[PDB]
Ligand binder design. Sequence first.
Ligand SMILES: *[C@@H]1O[C@H](CO)[C@@H](O[C@@H]2O[C@H](CO)[C@@H](O)[C@H](O)[C@H]2NC(C)=O)[C@H](O)[C@H]1NC(C)=O
Ligand SMILES: *[C@@H]1O[C@H](CO)[C@@H](O[C@@H]2O[C@H](CO)[C@@H](O)[C@H](O)[C@H]2NC(C)=O)[C@H](O)[C@H]1NC(C)=O
Ligand SMILES: *[C@@H]1O[C@H](CO)[C@@H](O[C@@H]2O[C@H](CO)[C@@H](O)[C@H](O)[C@H]2NC(C)=O)[C@H](O)[C@H]1NC(C)=O
Ligand code: NAG
Ligand code: NAG
Ligand code: NAG
Ligand code: NAG
Ligand code: NAG
Ligand code: NAG
Ligand code: NAG
Ligand code: NAG
Ligand code: NAG
Ligand code: NAG
Lengths: 172, 315, 48, 49, 163, 48
Amino acid sequence: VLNDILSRLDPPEAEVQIDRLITGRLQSLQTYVTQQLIRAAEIRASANLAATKMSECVLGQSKRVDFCGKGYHLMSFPQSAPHGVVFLHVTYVPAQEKNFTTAPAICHDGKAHFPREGVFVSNGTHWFVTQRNFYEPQIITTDNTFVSGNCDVVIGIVNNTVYDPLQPELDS
Amino acid sequence: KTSVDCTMYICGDSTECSNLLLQYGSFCTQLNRALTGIAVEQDKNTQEVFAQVKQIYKTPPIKDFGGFNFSQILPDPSKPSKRSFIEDLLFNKVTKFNGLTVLPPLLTDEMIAQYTSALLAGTITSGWTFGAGAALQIPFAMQMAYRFNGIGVTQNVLYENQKLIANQFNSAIGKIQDSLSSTASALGKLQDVVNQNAQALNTLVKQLSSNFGAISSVLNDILSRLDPPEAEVQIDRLITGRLQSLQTYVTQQLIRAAEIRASANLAATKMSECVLGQSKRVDFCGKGYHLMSFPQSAPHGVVFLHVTYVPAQEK
Amino acid sequence: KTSVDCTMYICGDSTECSNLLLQYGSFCTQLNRALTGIAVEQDKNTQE
Amino acid sequence: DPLSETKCTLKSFTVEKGIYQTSNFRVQPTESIVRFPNITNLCPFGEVF
Amino acid sequence: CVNFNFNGLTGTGVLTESNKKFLPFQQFGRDIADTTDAVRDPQTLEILDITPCSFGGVSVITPGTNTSNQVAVLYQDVNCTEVNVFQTRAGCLIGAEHVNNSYECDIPIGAGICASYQTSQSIIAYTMSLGAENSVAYSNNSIAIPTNFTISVTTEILPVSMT
Amino acid sequence: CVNFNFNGLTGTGVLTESNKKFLPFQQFGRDIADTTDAVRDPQTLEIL
Ligand SMILES: *[C@@H]1O[C@H](CO)[C@@H](O[C@@H]2O[C@H](CO)[C@@H](O)[C@H](O)[C@H]2NC(C)=O)[C@H](O)[C@H]1NC(C)=O
Ligand SMILES: *[C@@H]1O[C@H](CO)[C@@H](O[C@@H]2O[C@H](CO)[C@@H](O)[C@H](O)[C@H]2NC(C)=O)[C@H](O)[C@H]1NC(C)=O
Ligand SMILES: *[C@@H]1O[C@H](CO)[C@@H](O[C@@H]2O[C@H](CO)[C@@H](O)[C@H](O)[C@H]2NC(C)=O)[C@H](O)[C@H]1NC(C)=O
Ligand SMILES: *[C@@H]1O[C@H](CO)[C@@H](O)[C@H](O)[C@H]1NC(C)=O
Ligand SMILES: *[C@@H]1O[C@H](CO)[C@@H](O)[C@H](O)[C@H]1NC(C)=O
Ligand SMILES: *[C@@H]1O[C@H](CO)[C@@H](O)[C@H](O)[C@H]1NC(C)=O
Ligand SMILES: *[C@@H]1O[C@H](CO)[C@@H](O)[C@H](O)[C@H]1NC(C)=O
Ligand SMILES: *[C@@H]1O[C@H](CO)[C@@H](O)[C@H](O)[C@H]1NC(C)=O
Ligand SMILES: *[C@@H]1O[C@H](CO)[C@@H](O)[C@H](O)[C@H]1NC(C)=O
Ligand SMILES: *[C@@H]1O[C@H](CO)[C@@H](O)[C@H](O)[C@H]1NC(C)=O
Ligand SMILES: *[C@@H]1O[C@H](CO)[C@@H](O)[C@H](O)[C@H]1NC(C)=O
Ligand SMILES: *[C@@H]1O[C@H](CO)[C@@H](O)[C@H](O)[C@H]1NC(C)=O
Ligand SMILES: *[C@@H]1O[C@H](CO)[C@@H](O)[C@H](O)[C@H]1NC(C)=O
């Protein structure tokens, strides 16, 4: 207690006592300030991360994997909180899945057909082309698939027929 | 995960020194608390960097990966700790009782190897789906077709050049093997980290040999030689000096741990956006268009093998 | 890219002050080490 | 008890789940030993008395 | 463990038969970090290694006092001889029932060992599990495609500012 | 606000009639910082 030292000693040695006290308290203050500075650097890093998430997650739609919630990111909603923010990340997650036999491409007339968007699948007997994130089987035609070269090079090709929409119209 | 016992470091086996030290309040409590926080933070860093897969997938015995050869990154069933070739290279290319202790990491290297194996098997046998949700198998050729579509190159390019791409990938992996086996400095960063810490500790220990203005750096000699009235001042000097040295060491550790936390956050982001998926951020996952990545453990660190696509012959 | 001379700052041109300072051990060399590290970090920042 | 040790070291009557460090176990020295070279040297007091 | 005072030096530690070959004129050893390592006994021409006496932190593993008051004690980095006892790479654990079944880590101990309060109820220490294993039925002409889906809202919390 | 000195304990501050339920043997209170908080008047049986 500084008051006790001032009330109990004259300046000649009160100065030494107060010097010791001042040195101790100054060291404590410096330690506290350094701790605060390092923690503020931590919080600044977290705040930059939060700002980046708000920019690229709320004001848009991030395709960065796992950066905006587990699964495929749909959107985000921000919420305040005492000295922080809370993101509700709305994401799309496939739930029910089925096995299928698949082929990278199919011959029709020697030429090979590759799917524009989606993959070829077979339920055992027939072959469809379905988008790769949701089983939506569609008949294989020349507007779902594009030709390239011939089917002596691709590995794993399977035979099938590629229905052509223009042929029935031409016949009719 | 270093931890220092201030009472034994400052006042090794000396009741009077401890009584004098007890005047300085709660310095030890906050120093020990900071070091404990550092250790906890390191555990959290490793946990978040690696423990990103809900399950532990394992590759099937068949290696019909469209011609791709992963035998240099998948675990070796006949190996010291089920580590892959590149993992073992990384582990082999990186190299007391005075109140200083080294707490063990929560996740042993075997567990980190298992985590990298699970992530790698998921990436190989399911692509990116295993990150989003349930793992959905897919032939590797079709996964690479997805990736090529992802980089604006139509898929037929792959299927017409499948063997060439597989051979090029194998050659690249072999070149990486040779580079890692030949040049030890490649893992510099990791080594550097280790080095720095050691130096810190050494410096701290060397501070026990400084008199800080006292008559001798040895506490016992001061106690046995001088009378208590002046030995008290001498031990006050020694305690101030040793406390200042400890504070400097703790502050340096805090700053270096902030650096390492930033590095670990960057590594976690890279693993999430690079391995579990396919990044479209330029120069964030290797020079060129990014195709995929493979993680590999390392002592207190991670190593990404970035597989990327680079146009070569221009007309 | 600052750099501070510990001995010359604390004990500018004085043998006795330097001899008293060197009793504290490595309280000076590590400051120079840190500042050189800072300078190298700046150069690496610019090059990156 | 160690639980009370944790209670005081945290300055609270209630402790949340976790692992805390409270003190240091150190084996104490059972006895003391003093070692010096052989007392070969001898002052010539026998000559005088 | 003895408190010793050789010719001019004093310290505390355990003296053990050494493996070094001191020169005929060397007395006190020294480690790399300017620490006494071995000494030459003044009477017997034998070199004694000085290993400082065992010590380590005493961690108290506890479930929250709200639920129960039973605790376990971990003596860090010591054998269980110098103290239902578990010898782990982290040290000696007392009061923890060692089980074989793996579970998610609750109170981390170290070296892959975590402790927790579980069922009649007691504290157990176990090698933490990384998750249920699984095998993907991968084959060169098989693809698994989803048929349904779920919209999941997750929660990510980030601190922004201090006081 | 006055410069007070009770039985040798010196301080500066305002003295306000306190509602604290001091026990008959307690002479004065303290704050967590080891500083006086409330005192019982030596001359009058009052706590402030
Ligand atoms: C695979 O899908 C095809 C197309 O839906 C199935 O073929 C049809 O089966 C229904 C009976 O469920 C018939 O009414 C249609 O005439 C069939 N169409 C064709 C073009 O064949 C086929 O049965 C399915 N196979 C399996 C094993 O489920
Ligand atoms: C898809 O059908 C064609 C027929 O149009 C198959 O081509 C035949 O291949 C055999 C070799 O297995 C040859 O002996 C025949 O001469 C080929 N026929 C023609 C008309 O070229 C082709 O093999 C089938 N694909 C698969 C995977 O069985
Ligand atoms: C994947 O590549 C590795 C080498 O990069 C192959 O292993 C080699 O196999 C040959 C033939 O038995 C041996 O002579 C070499 O010594 C092996 N090298 C190593 C490093 O093991 C491996 O066989 C390849 N995988 C497949 C499926 O072919
Ligand atoms: C696909 O077949 C495998 C057989 O190896 C089976 O284990 C798996 O459950 C099947 N997929 C689904 C969605 O049932
Ligand atoms: C796929 O693997 C089977 C063995 O299970 C083999 O018979 C078949 O030829 C393979 N197909 C391709 C395209 O490699
Ligand atoms: C294209 O033409 C320029 C000059 O017109 C020439 O310098 C360049 O080498 C050419 N590109 C290639 C690939 O040869
Ligand atoms: C010291 O004296 C003891 C007996 O008192 C003897 O055994 C020992 O050899 C002596 N040592 C030397 C170096 O003379
Ligand atoms: C003198 O000799 C006697 C033996 O009679 C012996 O006891 C004594 O110690 C000797 N004096 C001194 C000073 O050594
Ligand atoms: C303590 O446990 C009770 C259940 O008996 C629960 O209602 C309460 O919220 C718990 N308190 C804390 C602080 O965990
Ligand atoms: C603990 O015991 C093991 C074998 O029981 C032994 O190898 C080890 O040296 C002991 N620990 C110490 C500090 O001596
Ligand atoms: C655990 O399994 C080992 C064999 O792997 C056995 O020796 C030990 O008794 C078992 N302990 C318990 C508690 O089941
Ligand atoms: C998808 O899951 C929901 C459960 O939320 C279920 O009600 C629905 O029938 C499922 N759809 C299909 C096609 O199975
Ligand atoms: C003297 O002090 C006593 C007790 O402190 C008190 O009761 C009394 O009134 C005081 N006398 C005067 C004249 O104030």
